């Protein structure tokens, strides 16, 4: 037995989002819904077709029809960005079945320009004969960003690793980038910089081996 | 309240057996059916099976041949064994409490609550615990009223590491970034917190790094940098 869902649902802030779940004449069984936000376990959000567990906002409601079961979220908040999964039990084979899941994204949130923080190697790490520059980019939206590193205003590509952006508790985005270097390389240039490009504009931070 | 907590090995070599345990608080095992679910990274939820303390079990068709679920009432625990793992078995494994109502001729069964999940990585590579370094606040990581400070967590395997600050007492302003996978096959990540710049001379900041795959915990003091 199979449970189908749309792969994604887009919705504007405050609008209503609807996530639908079709299965083998579901309507004969009972549908349950789970919310899973990035990096967390599922939480039950609706059970028994339309019941709200203690602690879930009223704006979460569950409905059903003939071949489709629906989860509705009124007044959608950026905080409701999540993957949602319907679920039923198959009483003949005695098997639990999940839908494939629906990723809900609320688009048209306010633009936020990034803050960039750049940490130089710690003396502790330099004393272990290593060196890592750490560029943390926070409080930005939308999510797309590019990072470039420079030593004395010349580009660096070796030794760079950068994470794809992820939501913070704010619902704004954050990302990180590392430049790995030997202690010698760190001390051999006058400065290093991390430049972030977001929505056509850039923010650059600079660190120097000679400032503490 | 009812809490569930999975514990696992972190890393499992191909063809060997995965063993997990779920410890239950706040209710007796004998009062419910208990389930295991899993989720491959990037993918969906897949039920594994259930158990009841009198011996009843049913397992997923795909996994029936390789799965054993068991129960230990004397420790209020249930467990999962999955033999002969391959890379397809790398996943977050969740335990969950089954809730059920008796409706005629049918089954209404759902899960409330779930545990936190534990990542199992199937790999021939060896475990490696992290090295942790401070990201010290300085006159250049400040933005007026606040300063950012952090911990760099380097060169560990497998995922995941989790980080708390001041033993969980400090939650406001915390962000732990996803890991990078380096060319060496090792992961690194950073956790940062923003705090009053006023506080830096008179408040202690400690990052608590946990790498359960290596049974390692590191509590690293992060102090203002003094040149």
Numbering used by the authors:
A (entry chain L): 2 to 9, 11 to 95, 95A, 95B, 96 to 106, 106A, 107 to 211
B (entry chain H): 1 to 82, 82A, 82B, 82C, 83 to 100, 100A, 100B, 100C, ...
From the paper:
We also solved a 1.7 Å-resolution crystal structure of the ACS122 Fab but was unable to crystallize ACS114 Fab by itself. NS-EM of three Fabs (ACS122, ACS124 and ACS125; one from every timepoint) in complex with the autologous AMC009 SOSIP trimer showed that they bound the gp120-gp41 interface. In addition, the gp120-gp41 interface NAbs ACS122 and ACS125 were less broad and potent and neutralized 8% and 7% of tested viruses with a IC50 geometric mean of 12 and 20 μg/ml, respectively. Moreover, ACS122 contains lower levels of SHM in its HC and LC (24 and 10 nucleotide substitutions respectively) compared to 35022 (96 and 71 nucleotide changes in HC and LC, respectively), and lacks the 8 amino-acid insertion in HC framework 3 that characterizes 35O22. Interestingly, NS-EM and cryo-EM 2D-class averages of ACS122 in complex with AMC009 SOSIP trimer showed that ACS122 induced dissociation of AMC009 trimer into individual gp120-gp41 protomers.
Here, HIV-1 envelope glycoproteins (Env)-specific IgG+ B cells were isolated at various time points post infection from an HIV-1 infected elite neutralizer to obtain monoclonal antibodies (mAbs). Multiple antibody lineages were isolated targeting distinct epitopes on Env, including the gp120-gp41 interface, CD4-binding site, silent face and V3 region. High-resolution cryo-electron microscopy structures of the neutralizing mAbs (NAbs) in complex with an Env trimer generated from the same individual revealed that the NAbs used multiple strategies to neutralize the virus; blocking the receptor binding site, binding to HIV-1 Env N-linked glycans, and disassembly of the trimer. These results show that diverse NAbs can complement each other to achieve a broad and potent neutralizing serum response in HIV-1 infected individuals.
